[PDB]
Design a protein around this nucleic acid. Sequence first.
RNA 1: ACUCUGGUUUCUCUUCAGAUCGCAUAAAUCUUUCGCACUAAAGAUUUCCGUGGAGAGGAACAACUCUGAGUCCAAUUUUUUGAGGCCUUGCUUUGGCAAGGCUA
Lengths: 98, 84, 81, 73, 44, 243, 111
Amino acid sequence: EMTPEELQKREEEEFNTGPLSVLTQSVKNNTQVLINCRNNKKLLGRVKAFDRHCNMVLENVKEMWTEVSKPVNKDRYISKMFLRGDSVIVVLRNPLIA
Amino acid sequence: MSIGVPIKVLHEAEGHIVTCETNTGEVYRGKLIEAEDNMNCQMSNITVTYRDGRVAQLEQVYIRGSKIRFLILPDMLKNAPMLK
Amino acid sequence: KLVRFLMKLSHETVTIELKNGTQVHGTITGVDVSMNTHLKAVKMTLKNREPVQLETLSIRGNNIRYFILPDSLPLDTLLVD
Amino acid sequence: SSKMLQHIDYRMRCILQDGRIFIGTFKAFDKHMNLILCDCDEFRKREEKRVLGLVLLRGENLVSMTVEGPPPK
Amino acid sequence: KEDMPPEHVRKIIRDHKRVYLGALKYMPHAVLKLLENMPMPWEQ
Amino acid sequence: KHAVQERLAVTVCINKIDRLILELKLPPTDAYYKLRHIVDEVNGLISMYSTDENLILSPLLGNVCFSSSQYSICFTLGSFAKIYADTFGDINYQEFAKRLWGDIYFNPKTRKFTKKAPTSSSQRSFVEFILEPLYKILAQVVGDVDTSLPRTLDELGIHLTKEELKLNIRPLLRLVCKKFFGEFTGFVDMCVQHIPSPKVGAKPKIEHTYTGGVDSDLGEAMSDCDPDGPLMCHTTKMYSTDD
Amino acid sequence: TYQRWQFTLPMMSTLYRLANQLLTDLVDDNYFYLFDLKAFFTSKALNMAIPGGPKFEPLVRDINLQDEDWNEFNDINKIIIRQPIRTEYKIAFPYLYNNLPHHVHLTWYHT
RNA sequence: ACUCUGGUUUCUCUUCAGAUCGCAUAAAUCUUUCGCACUAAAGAUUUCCGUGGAGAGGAACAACUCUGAGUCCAAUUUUUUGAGGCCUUGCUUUGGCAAGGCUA
């Protein structure tokens, strides 16, 4: 790395202008965020804190996953948790329905 | 503080008989010639058993270290000074 | 770093889901900077198999799918620096 | 990392990524979490035990470990 | 534990009884311990 | 002559290098000249008594070690390069060792080793990186033990206890050099790389010292050095118990 | 109590320079070859005097150089004389140039 | 990088010491040896000059240097993913497990 400086706050510039600023939005504006993870599972919730590894902590989350019978989607509720960053496919801020 | 004990033990295994099991379920038993800090193993006189069970002979083998599941070492290495 | 937040969560009863679908229910005792988690009084339910009770368990930080937190955790004061 | 120097010499069963179970004596570990297990046996599922001995497993495939027996004499 | 003043033994000797007799048995020790602590040529 | 005639692998350990420093007090460059001259004399003798060339002795090949047994010093080029690597992690000691002998000079501006001396007053690689540090260690220990020894010991990373710094100069030098160098790994490196194992060296041994010749059937089994074959033990010394 | 001293090298050097008039200024013990404690012990045990060394009295009364009769062994007609077997030769190799060696302290060889 | 030992000096007492106990080196007695015993050797004992180790007590100032102990790493190689989904057989602990064939 060309920038070995001790006073490294470029990681939050990544959280302001970089791609990961999207989840920092939900940190500040507190909107429902939809998570699609590697087990063909989906997670909807609200993210509170995370970092460059994109591992984050959520609260009041609903996770749904489908089981075959033929695919029927089940749902279970989790109050507060913490997802590892590398175990995700996509991260989505829920769209503005209004 | 830098280099772990198990890598040192693997270094000690050079020259003995070792059996190697890669992620493709292939078993390589042969004389370990050399090893690095990573699990890159240069090993010889291989009796190789595939997943189905077919056995073959292959005199020279070099296995990528990332692709080892586990390595079975000879029992005399249990007396290595590094294991004390 | 959010792993430091996990290290601050010593002595709490939690459940962990793994990439192999194994649900281990126990009290967290130690967390490593690399998320390597050691649990005590663990109740592990490997999927497609009956649950088994054990005293101590250690799960590699790579193999952890996600974490489950209880309701009485003041995360706010715990995610401060 | 004292959380595992406390577990040395203890008879430990470790769960693998492919579902393999390795029961043996915990000897050594490193930062990448490669494990040294002596007089180790592998348990696979149909019940069967295959005695192997001194196993050096890479950290990649190691999942979960648990004490099964007290240290021997 | 008592270091006598140097002016006491001076007067005692200058002014000159088995107490007196029993001590003289050790005169060779007094001679030996005196020649042993003999000043070196660089000491006045 | 006797060793190259008996068909034995020959290696050289130039012992008592401290005599170049403490007794003769030669400048480091002239110490290097003395060592190179000794190595050249050995090479000339070997070539005189042997026809094949594969017994070239040179510290670049790891054949020659430098040592001072009185002060627990023993290093090859590779072992000293490994000391450097352990101190500064990012260097590859095997490639470093290949530039630490001969008329190869270091250029600190380009950080590269050249065959031509940068400008003038530039010292060879061996002097700059190996001989000068050793000269300085010995000089500090034997001249400035009270004044400027703890600071240099701090620089090298050696920490000596207080009752340990009270030792006489010779035991203190032995102790300091032991801490700095450690085990005699250079000697073992030499003898592992350039001395055949019994399995590999069995064939010349049978060729030379066996009356039946290697071609004999028993000669073949002996040349394999197989421990499950016929017993063949050769005894040359007889040691008497004190009675 | 004045029972131990710890000195610095700049002081030891000054003390060493001041006392040079009383110092031999030798760097070796090769100067005392065949002229040291072991050599004198051997000469006393062998009843011989090294030139320039101490002259003791016979340790034990025994046979003499004029007491051994002619034999076929020690016959002086079988002896080739090139250089006399000096006493120093008999001290240097007490078991070769000497018969019946007892209390012979082996001298320190070359340094 | 945070906390708890151990100090050093000095005076006295007790015991062990075949360790160059002492990088120096005396005297006496007995025995033997030969001379014919300061001007001579050996063996043994003793006494002296005066030591080290350990332990014990006294009394003078330094108390945490030292000896210890308790206390910055997401892009191949390990811990920031090639993961999950379909088909057959033996047994179904009717939850599915085991192997193989696959799709991604």
